[PDB]
C-alpha cells in the first residue's frame, strides 16, 4: 500500500491498548505529576494556568539578570566560566562576590571594575524579587525545577493515554465519513476532542474513560464538519437547524405517504414558517465548473459562463461619440456656461462640484450658478441645438 491513511492505521498498532488497570494507573501518574506541581504552587484550571505562568514569569525575570551578568562578566571581560560559577553560587544576592573577584588580581580582574558599574544595577533588579515573592533567588529556581518535573510526568502519561485509545477515534469517525469532508480530517478533529477529554477527566469518578472520550470526540467531529465541510461556511447553529429540518422531513415520509407539506414543518418545528423557505433557499451548494455538460461531451459548466461585467464595444463606441458630441455642443455656449457645466458635472475634469463649490471660485455664489445652469440647459433644450444629442436618448 501507498496512501498515508495506511501509514497511520498500521502505525497505531505499535501502541497497545489499555484496560482496565492501565487507565487507572496512568491517570494516577498524571495526577501525581500535577500533584507535584500543586505543592510547588504553595511557596478551575483557568486561574491555575495564570498561577503557573506567573511562576514561569518570575523564573524568566531571574534568568534574564543571570544571562546579562554572565555575558557582561565572561564575554565582555574574559573571566573563566568556573571562576564565575564558583563565586556566584551561594550569594546571587549581594555584590560581595564581585569585589572578591576583583581582588583575585588575574589579568581579567581589571575588566571587572568596568562591568561592576553595569552589574550593580542589574543586581538590584534581581534582589528586589526577594522582597516581592518572600523567597531567596535559589528557592525560585528549585521550585520551578520540581514543577517542570511534574509537567514532564503529566506529558508522558497523557501522550500514552491518547495513543492507547486512538482506535476509538476511528471507531467514531467511520460513522460520519460522507459529509463533504475527507476521512483523515474527521479522525484528526476527533483526536483533538480526545485530547480535550484526557485533560478534563477525573479517574476517580469510577466511570470508564470510553464514555467521556466518546462524547468529546463526537462533538469535535460533528462541529468540525459544520465548520469545514461547505465551501461557503455557515454559522454553527444553522447547520444544526438544517439537520433538524432534514430529520423531520425524513421521519414524516411514511406518515404523509410521499413527503410533508412545508407549512407542517413550521408546526412540527419550533420556528415560524417564513424562515423555513429561507433555510431551504440557503442550503444550495456550489457546482464544480468542471461538471460535464449535455451530450456527455468535453464541454463543462465552466465554459457556458459569460462575463457580464464587461461592456460590449457597441456601447463604448456610443460613449465616445457622446463624449465628442457634448464636447462640440458645450463649445457652442458661452465660456461662463461651459465652465459651469464642466464643473457641476465632471466633464473633462477631475471631479464634479456642488453649488457652493462652483460658486466659490466663480466670484458669484450659489444662486447665480443656479441661474446659469437652468439657463444653459434651457439654451440647449431648444431643438436645432439638441438634435445630435437627442439621438442619444432612446426610451
Amino acid at each position: 500500500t501507498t496512501d498515508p491513511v495506511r501509514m497511520y492505521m498500521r502505525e497505531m498498532g505499535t501502541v497497545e491498548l489499555l484496560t482496565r488497570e492501565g487507565e487507572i494507573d496512568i491517570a494516577k501518574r498524571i495526577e501525581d505529576g500535577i500533584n507535584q506541581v500543586q505543592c510547588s504552587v504553595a511557596e478551575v484550571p483557568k486561574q491555575f494556568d495564570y498561577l503557573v505562568n506567573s511562576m514561569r514569569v518570575m523564573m524568566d525575570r531571574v534568568r534574564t539578570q543571570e544571562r546579562l551578568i554572565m555575558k557582561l562578566c565572561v564575554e565582555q571581560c574574559k573571566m573563566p566560566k568556573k571562576n564565575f560559577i564558583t563565586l556566584f553560587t551561594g550569594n546571587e544576592t549581594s555584590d560581595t562576590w564581585f569585589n572578591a573577584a576583583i581582588a583575585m588580581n588575574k589579568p581579567w580582574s581589571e575588566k571587572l571594575h568596568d562591568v561592576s558599574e553595569e552589574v550593580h544595577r542589574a543586581l538590584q533588579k534581581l534582589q528586589q524579587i526577594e522582597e516581592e515573592t518572600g523567597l531567596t533567588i535559589e528557592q525560585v529556581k528549585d521550585i520551578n525545577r520540581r514543577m517542570s518535573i511534574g509537567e514532564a510526568k503529566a506529558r508522558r502519561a497523557k501522550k500514552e493515554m491518547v495513543e492507547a485509545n486512538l482506535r476509538l477515534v476511528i471507531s467514531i469517525a467511520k460513522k460520519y465519513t460522507n459529509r463533504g469532508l475527507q476521512f483523515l480530517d474527521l479522525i484528526q478533529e476527533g483526536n483533538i476532542g480526545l485530547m480535550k477529554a484526557v485533560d478534563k477527566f477525573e479517574y476517580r469518578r469510577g466511570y470508564k474513560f470510553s464514555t467521556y472520550a466518546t462524547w468529546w470526540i463526537r462533538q469535535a467531529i460533528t462541529r468540525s464538519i459544520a465548520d469545514q465541510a461547505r465551501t461557503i461556511r455557515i454559522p454553527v447553529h444553522m447547520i444544526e437547524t438544517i439537520n433538524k429540518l432534514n430529520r423531520i422531513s425524513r421521519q414524516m415520509l411514511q406518515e404523509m405517504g410521499r413527503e410533508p407539506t412545508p407549512e407542517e414543518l413550521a408546526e412540527r418545528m419550533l420556528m415560524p414558517e417564513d424562515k423555513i423557505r429561507k433555510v431551504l433557499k440557503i442550503a444550495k451548494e456550489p457546482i464544480s465548473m468542471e461538471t460535464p455538460i449535455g451530450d456527455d461531451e468535453d464541454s463543462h459548466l465552466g465554459d457556458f459562463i459569460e462575463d457580464t461585467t464587461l461592456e460590449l464595444p457597441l456601447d463604448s463606441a456610443t460613449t465616445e461619440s457622446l463624449r465628442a458630441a457634448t464636447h462640440d455642443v458645450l463649445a457652442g455656449l458661452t465660456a461662463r456656461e461651459a465652465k459651469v457645466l464642466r464643473m457641476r458635472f465632471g466633464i473633462d475634469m477631475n471631479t464634479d462640484y456642488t453649488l457652493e463649490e462652483v460658486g466659490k471660485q466663480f466670484d458669484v455664489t450659489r444662486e447665480r450658478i443656479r441661474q446659469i445652469e437652468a439657463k444653459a440647459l434651457r439654451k440647449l433644450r431648444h431643438p436645432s441645438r439638441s438634435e445630435v444629442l437627442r439621438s442619444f436618448l432612446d426610451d
Binding site: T2, Y8, K158, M195, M289, T318
Partner: protein, 1239 residues
C-alpha cells in the same frame, strides 16, 4: 517584451508577488455574499469586487483611486485587478514540490543521487535520515528506523543530526554543497571506465552545472510559502438560476488551508507525535493534490466520483490551456451554414447570404451609415440596421464590394482547406460554393457545412487577395498537378461534345468556321457528333515570341469545333481532337497554365465549366434499367465454373487433394470465371453500338450512358460496371479475406439474402476502417507539423554541389515513375553533360522547368544529380536554391515561405485516403523490351558449361536499349546462369538469368507512422561494419559469435549473433560495409550508420512512397525529404574537438567546429544521430514550443531547474503570445525589426 524565462521560485520571491496572507478557508458570507477577511476572495488581500468602489462603500468614485480606506483596508481601484493579484499561505511545516519528486528524472533524486523510493519513504515519516554528520560513525546521508535511532542519540548528542519528513529533505538540500560534490564526480568520470560509472554520472554532472548556471538554489525544491491563484482565475460567480459555480481549485485550497491551520493549532496545543505526523502527511497530500492531482491518490470532489481538476491539469492535454486555448480559439466576425452550388459564380467569388452579411459586417455598416449623414450617431445606425430599413441594403452593397471573405471546410487537412472568395450577396440562408473548388476542399453537397471569416485589417484584406485567393491557388503544393479541375458534369458534357458517330446528320459536309457549326447544331440541321471537317484558325506564337495565326481545315467533329471557341488563343487544337474525358481535361488545363499563364487559365476553366454544365444538361444523359446490359453468355459461364468446382469436391472427399489445396483450387477457378463474365459484358458494351456507315453495318465505340460515364471519368469506373451488369466477384471477411461461395448475381438482377449477408462482412471493415482511421491520421499529421514548424526558407543559396543523385525508379520490368517527374522543379547539383562525356546540357545549377525537362527527355539521359533539402549548407533553415521550386506559382520558391508546415500538410492530407491494413495476396527472369544486357557490380567466372556464372551476392541487371536509357533493373542471387554477360545484345526477350529455387508491416497508415518514427523492425537484419572476409566465433553460447576480419589495418571489431538466425553472407568472400549477411527488414539507424545520410534519406522516401503509390496518392519527394532532414538534425561528437559522447544540434557543431577549422585549430568529428519525428520534436531550443505540444509537466519542470530562456525565435511560440509569425509577411516585418535589434 522580447523573451520569456522560467526558473525556480524562492520563498522571498514567492512572497513578493503576494499582496496578503490567507488565514481562513472562507469564500463569502452566505447571507451578504461579500468576501470575508483573509478568505480566498478577500477584497483586502486582492482587490474590490466592484470597479472603482470600496468594500465598505465609503469611497465611491473615480475622484479618489489610490487610497486604502482605514475602514476595511480596501483600496478603490479597477476590479479587474482581482485577476492579477496573487496571495500566499505560510506553511507551518515544509512541503516538497511534487513535480521535482514524481517527474521521471526526479530532481531531488539525482540531485543528491539518492533513490526516489527512499525519499518517498522518508516523507511518509516511516524512517529517519542523517544530515551533516561530520565526525560520526555514520555518513552525512543515511537511513535508520525507530529502534535504530532510539539508542543512537546517546552515542553523540551533538555533531549528529537525523531528521524525518520534509524538513529533513529540505535541510539535506540546504547544507548540501553543490560545488564540492561536483568537483569530485568529474574525476569519477575520468579515471574509471565501465560505463556503469558513466551511466548517470555524465547526466548528474550536467544537472549540477546547469543548476549552478541558472542561479537558483536547491533549497527551493521544498515550498516554504504556498502561492495562491487570483480569485477571478477560480470564480465563485453565481450560476443562475440560483446555484453557485466554483472551481475545484477552491476546494483544494480550502483543504490545504484547513490542514495548515490544524497543524498550527496542534503545534501550539502541544500534541504528541503520531497525531502531528499524520497531520503533516495530510498536508503534503493536500499540497500535492492541489499542484498535480492523480499522481498519488486522486482526491475527489464532494458529491461525485469525479476527481477535482488541479492546476497542472489546467495546462497539459488537448483539452485544457495550451492546445485548446493558446493555439486555437473561437473567433469573432465568423459564421457557419450549409453550402450549395451556384455555378454562375466566377472562380474568385462565392454566394453569401444577406442575413449573414448583415451580422458579420455590422461595425462596417454602422460606420458607413454614420459617415454619409444617414445616421446621427452610432446608436441610430444600430437601430436602423435593426429595423431592416431599405436604405441599409445599398450600404451593404457598398461595404461588401471588393472585400474578400475566408471560406473554411470543417476538416482542414491542408492549406487549401481555407480559401478566400469575393462575396456575392444572395437571398436565402444557404451559402453558394463554386464547383471547381469542391475538389480542393474535399466537400460534397450532401449536407456538408462550411464556415466564413471576415478579414478586419487592410493587411488581412490584402492577404486574402494576393495569397489565399481562390484564383491565386490552382495547382497543389504537394504535387504540380492542378487541384482545380472539372469533376463530374463538366467532363461528361465535354465528352458528349467531342464524341463522334458515323452517319450523323450532315456528316462529311464543310463549314466556314466554328460559328457555322454552332448555327448548324442549334438549328437542328446538323448533329453534334458528325464527322464533319471545317476550317479553324489556330494561333501559335513562334520564333521570337511573336504570335502568328494559322488557318487550315482539319479532321474534326461539329462538337469539337464548337468546343474550340472556348480554348484560349495560344493552344494548338490538337488538344481538342479526341474523346475528351476528364483525365485529359486535366492535362489540357495543365498545358494551358504552363504555356499561357494564370490569367488565361482561370477564365479557361470558368468557360469549361459554363459550357460543360449546359451541354450535359441539354444532352439528357440519363440512366435506365435497360442501360445495364447483362451478357447472354453469363448463364453458361456461371454454370461451367459451378460444375468445375464439383470435380474438386470429389477430389477432396477422397483425399487426392488436401483441404487447402482444394480451397485454393476452387477460389482460383471462380476468380477466372469472374474474369470471363466481366470480359463478356465489357466486350458487349465497348463495341456494343453498331450502325450502318453510308448504308452498311459497322461497329464503333458505344454511346451507352453508364459506359460513357465510365469512359469519360466523370463517375464510376470499370470495377463498378462489373458488379452492375455481371457477377460481383467474391467477398472477403475481416480476415480469412476471401470466401469460396462467390456472388453469382449482379446488382441489376438482385441479391438473395445469403449473398447480401456475405457482402456485409466486407462492407463493415470498409466503413469501420474509415471512422477510426480519422482519429489516427490526425495524430500522424499533427506530429508531422510539430516536427517541422520552425523550418522556413531563410537564404537565397547555400553553395553546395552535394545534392542527391536522381535516377528513375525502374523496379523489375518497367518504370514506376519516370525521371522527369522526380527531377522537374528542382536544381542540378552539377553540370549534366550530354551522353557524350565532357559536354554541357545544363549549367552548374539552374531551376529545371518543363523546357529543360523536355530537352533532357529528348537526349538519352536517365542520370541527373539533383540538389536536395537534406544535404544543404544552411543553418536554422533552408535556402531557396537547394529546396527547389514549388507553389501554386511555378517559379523558384520565395524567401520566408514556411515550407515545413506545408510539407507536413502535403503528407497529412493524403493520410486520410490510406488504409489501416494491407493483406497482400501474391523463377527465372524474363527481359521484356528489346535492348542490351548491362550488368552492374558483378564478379563472375567460366565453368564446365562454358557460359558465365555470378560469384557475387549483389548483381543488378540493367538494359541499355537502342536509345541508351535504363528501363530494366533485376537482382540475381549467387551462382546464376548468365547467357550473354555484360554489354551484350539481347533479342526480344532472350533469357539470360537462371538460378534455383532454394539452395537448401500492417501496413498502410500505421506503416507510414512506423517509418517516420524510425521504429526497429521485429526481426532486424544486421549489417557488416567494414570490408574483409568474415570470420566465425567460438561456439553456440547463448546465441553465437561472429568475428569481423578487416583486411589491412585495425581489425579488432566484433559482434555476436544468434545461431537461430540463418546466415546468408559468404564465408571466405570479401564483403564490403553495409552488406546483408542476413536476409530481413532493414532499420533506419543501421542504414544511416553503415551507408550514409543520402542512402538513408533515399531509403525513407523510397519506402514511404510505396504505400502512397499503392493508393493513387502522388506527392513530390521534397516534403518527405524536408521531414527526413528534420529527423536527423541531432548528432554526437566523438573526439571532443577543441571544446566539449555528447549530443548536440548539427548546425551548432558546424558553427563551432568549421569556423575554428578555418582558424587552423583542431577539427571536431560528429556522428549523425537518427531520431523519429516525435523524438526529434521532443528536443527543441524553445521550451514554450515544446511544453505546448506534449509532456507539459516534464518539459516545464526540466526548463525550470535549468533556468532556461526563450526568445521565441519561431512560429508556435509566436502564435502563443499573439505576434507576427516569422514567415511570409511576418518574415518581411521581422526582418526589418530584427535588423535594428541586437546591433
Amino acid at each position: 517584451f522580447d523573451a520569456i524565462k522560467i526558473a525556480l521560485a524562492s520563498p522571498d520571491m514567492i512572497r513578493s508577488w503576494s499582496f496578503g496572507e490567507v488565514k481562513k478557508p472562507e469564500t463569502i458570507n452566505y447571507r451578504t455574499f461579500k468576501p470575508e477577511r483573509d478568505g480566498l476572495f478577500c477584497a483586502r488581500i486582492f482587490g474590490p469586487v466592484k470597479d472603482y468602489e470600496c468594500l465598505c462603500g465609503k469611497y465611491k468614485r473615480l475622484k479618489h483611486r489610490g487610497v486604502i480606506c482605514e475602514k476595511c483596508g480596501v483600496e478603490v481601484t479597477q476590479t479587474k485587478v482581482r485577476r492579477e493579484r496573487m496571495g500566499h499561505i505560510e506553511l507551518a511545516s515544509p512541503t516538497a514540490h511534487i513535480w521535482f519528486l514524481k517527474s521521471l528524472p526526479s530532481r531531488i533524486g539525482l540531485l543528491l543521487d539518492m533513490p526516489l523510493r527512499d525519499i518517498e519513504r522518508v516523507l511518509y515519516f516511516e524512517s529517519y535520515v542523517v544530515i551533516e554528520g561530520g565526525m560520526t560513525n555514520l555518513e552525512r546521508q543515511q537511513i535508520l528506523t525507530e529502534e535504530q535511532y532510539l539508542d543512537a542519540l546517546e552515542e553523540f548528542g551533538d555533531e549528529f543530526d537525523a531528521k524525518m519528513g520534509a524538513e529533513a529533505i529540505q535541510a539535506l538540500l540546504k547544507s548540501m554543497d553543490l560545488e564540492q560534490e561536483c568537483e569530485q564526480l568529474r574525476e569519477e568520470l575520468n579515471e574509471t571506465n565501465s560505463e556503469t560509472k558513466r551511466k548517470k554520472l555524465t547526466k548528474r554532472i550536467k544537472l549540477l552545472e546547469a543548476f549552478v548556471q541558472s542561479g537558483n538554489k536547491p533549497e527551493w525544491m521544498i515550498l516554504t510559502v504556498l502561492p495562491v491563484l487570483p480569485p477571478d482565475l477560480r470564480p465563485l460567480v453565481p450560476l443562475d438560476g440560483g446555484r453557485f459555480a466554483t472551481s475545484d481549485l477552491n476546494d483544494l485550497y480550502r483543504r490545504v488551508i484547513n490542514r495548515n491551520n490544524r497543524l498550527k493549532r496542534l503545534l501550539d496545543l502541544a500534541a504528541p507525535d503520531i497525531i502531528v505526523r499524520n497531520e503533516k502527511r495530510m498536508l503534503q497530500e493536500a499540497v500535492d493534490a492541489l499542484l498535480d492531482n492523480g499522481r498519488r491518490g486522486r482526491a475527489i470532489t464532494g458529491s461525485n466520483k469525479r476527481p477535482l481538476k488541479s492546476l497542472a491539469d489546467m495546462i497539459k492535454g488537448k483539452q485544457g490551456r495550451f492546445r485548446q486555448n493558446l493555439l486555437g480559439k473561437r473567433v469573432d466576425y465568423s459564421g457557419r451554414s450549409v453550402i450549395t452550388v451556384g455555378p454562375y459564380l466566377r472562380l474568385h467569388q462565392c454566394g453569401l447570404p444577406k442575413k449573414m452579411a448583415l451580422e458579420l459586417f455590422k461595425p462596417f455598416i454602422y460606420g458607413k451609415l454614420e459617415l454619409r449623414g444617414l445616421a446621427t450617431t452610432i446608436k441610430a445606425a444600430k437601430k436602423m440596421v435593426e429595423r431592416e430599413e431599405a436604405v441599409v441594403w445599398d450600404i451593404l452593397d457598398e461595404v461588401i464590394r471588393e472585400h474578400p471573405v475566408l471560406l473554411n471546410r470543417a476538416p482542414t487537412l491542408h492549406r487549401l482547406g481555407i480559401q478566400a472568395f469575393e462575396p456575392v450577396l444572395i437571398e436565402g440562408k444557404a451559402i453558394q460554393l463554386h464547383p471547381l473548388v469542391c475538389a480542393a476542399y474535399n466537400a460534397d453537397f450532401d449536407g456538408d457545412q462550411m464556415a466564413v471569416h471576415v478579414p478586419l485589417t487592410l493587411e488581412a484584406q490584402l492577404e486574402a487577395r494576393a495569397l489565399m485567393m481562390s484564383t491565386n491557388n490552382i495547382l497543389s503544393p504537394a504535387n504540380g498537378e492542378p487541384i482545380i479541375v472539372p469533376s463530374q458534369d463538366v467532363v461528361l458534357g465535354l465528352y458528349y461534345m467531342t464524341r463522334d458517330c458515323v452517319n450523323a446528320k450532315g456528316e462529311g459536309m464543310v463549314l466556314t468556321g466554328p460559328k457555322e457549326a454552332e448555327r448548324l447544331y442549334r438549328s437542328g440541321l446538323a448533329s453534334l457528333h458528325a464527322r464533319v471537317k471545317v476550317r479553324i484558325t489556330e494561333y501559335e506564337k513562334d520564333a521570337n515570341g511573336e504570335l502568328v495565326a494559322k488557318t487550315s481545315l482539319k479532321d474534326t467533329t461539329v462538337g469539337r469545333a464548337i468546343l474550340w471557341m472556348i480554348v484560349p488563343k495560344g493552344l494548338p487544337y490538337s488538344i481538342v481532337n479526341q474523346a475528351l474525358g476528364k483525365k485529359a481535361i486535366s492535362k489540357m488545363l495543365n498545358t494551358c497554365y504552363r504555356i499561357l499563364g494564370l490569367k488565361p487559365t482561370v477564365i479557361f476553366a470558368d468557360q469549361i465549366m459554363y459550357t460543360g454544365f449546359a451541354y450535359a444538361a441539354r444532352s439528357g444523359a440519363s440512366v435506365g434499367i435497360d442501360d445495364m446490359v447483362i451478357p447472354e453468355k453469363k448463364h453458361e459461364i456461371i454454370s461451367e465454373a459451378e460444375a468445375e468446382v464439383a470435380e474438386i469436391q470429389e477430389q477432396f472427399q477422397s483425399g487426392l487433394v488436401t483441404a487447402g489445396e482444394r480451397y485454393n483450387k476452387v477460389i482460383d477457378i471462380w476468380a477466372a470465371a469472374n474474369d470471363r463474365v466481366s470480359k463478356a459484358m465489357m466486350d458487349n458494351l465497348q463495341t456494343e453500338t453498331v450502325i450502318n456507315r453510308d448504308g452498311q453495318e459497322e461497329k464503333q465505340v458505344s454511346f451507352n450512358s453508364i459506359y460513357m460515364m465510365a469512359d469519360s471519368g466523370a463517375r464510376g469506373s470499370a470495377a463498378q460496371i462489373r458488379q452492375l451488369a455481371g457477377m460481383r466477384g467474391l467477398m472477403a471477411k475481416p480476415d480469412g479475406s476471401i470466401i469460396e461461395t462467390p456472388i453469382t448475381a449482379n446488382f441489376r438482377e438482385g441479391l438473395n439474402v445469403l449473398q447480401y449477408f456475405i457482402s456485409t462482412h466486407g462492407a463493415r471493415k470498409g466503413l469501420a476502417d474509415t471512422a477510426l482511421k480519422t482519429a489516427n491520421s490526425g495524430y500522424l499529421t499533427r506530429r508531422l507539423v510539430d516536427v517541422a514548424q520552425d523550418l522556413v526558407v531563410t537564404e537565397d543559396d547555400c553553395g553546395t554541389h552535394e545534392g542527391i543523385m536522381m535516377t528513375p525508379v525502374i523496379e523489375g520490368g518497367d518504370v514506376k515513375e519516370p525521371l522527369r517527374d522526380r527531377v522537374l522543379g528542382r536544381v542540378t547539383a552539377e553540370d549534366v553533360l550530354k551522353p557524350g562525356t565532357a559536354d554541357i546540357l545544363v549549367p552548374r545549377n539552374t531551376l529545371l522547368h518543363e523546357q529543360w525537362c523536355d530537352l533532357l527527355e529528348e537526349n538519352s539521359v536517365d542520370a541527373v544529380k539533383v540538389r536536395s533539402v537534406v544535404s544543404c549548407d544552411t543553418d536554422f533553415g533552408v535556402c531557396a536554391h537547394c529546396y527547389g521550386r514549388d507553389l501554386a506559382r511555378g517559379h523558384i520558391i520565395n524567401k520566408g515561405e514556411a515550407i515545413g508546415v506545408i510539407a507536413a500538410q502535403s503528407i497529412g492530407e493524403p493520410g486520410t485516403q490510406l488504409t489501416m491494413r494491407t493483406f497482400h495476396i501474391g523463377s527465372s527472369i524474363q527481359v521484356k523490351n528489346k535492348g542490351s544486357i548491362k550488368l552492374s557490380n558483378v564478379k563472375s567466372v567460366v565453368n564446365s558449361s562454358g557460359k558465365l556464372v555470378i560469384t557475387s551476392r549483389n548483381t543488378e541487371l540493367k538494359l541499355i536499349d537502342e536509345f541508351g536509357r535504363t528501363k530494366e533493373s533485376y537482382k540475381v542471387p549467387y551462382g546464376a546462369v548468365l547467357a550473354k554477360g555484360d554489354g551484350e545484345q539481347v533479342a526480344g526477350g532472350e533469357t539470360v538469368a537462371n538460378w534455383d529455387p532454394h539452395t537448401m508491416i500492417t501496413g498502410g497508415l500505421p506503416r507510414v507512422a512506423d517509418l517516420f518514427e524510425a521504429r526497429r523492425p521485429k526481426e532486424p537484419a544486421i549489417l557488416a561494419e567494414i570490408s574483409g572476409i568474415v570470420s566465425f566465433g567460438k561456439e553456440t553460447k547463448g546465441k553465437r559469435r561472429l568475428v569481423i576480419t578487416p583486411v589491412d589495418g585495425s581489425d579488432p571489431y566484433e559482434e555476436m549473433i544468434p545461431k537461430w538466425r540463418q546466415l546468408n553472407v559468404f564465408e571466405g568472400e570479401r564483403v564490403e560495409r553495409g552488406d546483408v549477411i542476413s536476409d530481413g527488414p532493414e532499420a533506419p539507424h543501421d542504414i544511416l550508420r553503415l551507408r550514409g545520410v543520402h542512402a538513408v534519406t533515399r531509403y525513407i522516401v523510397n519506402e514511404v512512397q510505396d504505400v502512397y503509390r499503392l493508393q493513387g496518392v502522388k506527392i513530390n519527394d521534397k516534403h518527405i525529404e524536408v521531414i527526413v532532414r528534420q529527423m536527423l538534425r541531432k548528432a554526437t561528437i566523438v573526439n571532443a574537438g577543441s571544446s566539449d559522447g555528447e549530443q548536440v544540434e548539427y548546425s551548432r557543431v558546424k558553427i563551432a567546429n568549421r569556423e575554428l577549422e578555418a582558424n587552423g585549430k583542431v577539427g571536431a568529428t560528429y556522428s549523425r544521430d537518427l531520431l523519429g519525428i516525435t523524438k526529434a520534436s521532443l528536443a527543441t531550443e524553445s521550451f514554450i514550443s515544446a511544453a505546448s505540444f506534449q509532456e507539459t509537466t516534464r518539459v516545464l519542470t526540466e526548463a525550470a531547474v535549468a533556468g532556461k530562456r526563450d526568445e521565441l525565435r519561431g512560429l508556435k511560440e509566436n502564435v502563443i503570445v499573439g505576434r507576427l509569425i516569422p514567415a511570409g509577411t511576418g518574415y518581411a516585418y521581422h526582418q526589418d525589426r530584427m535588423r535594428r535589434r541586437a546591433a
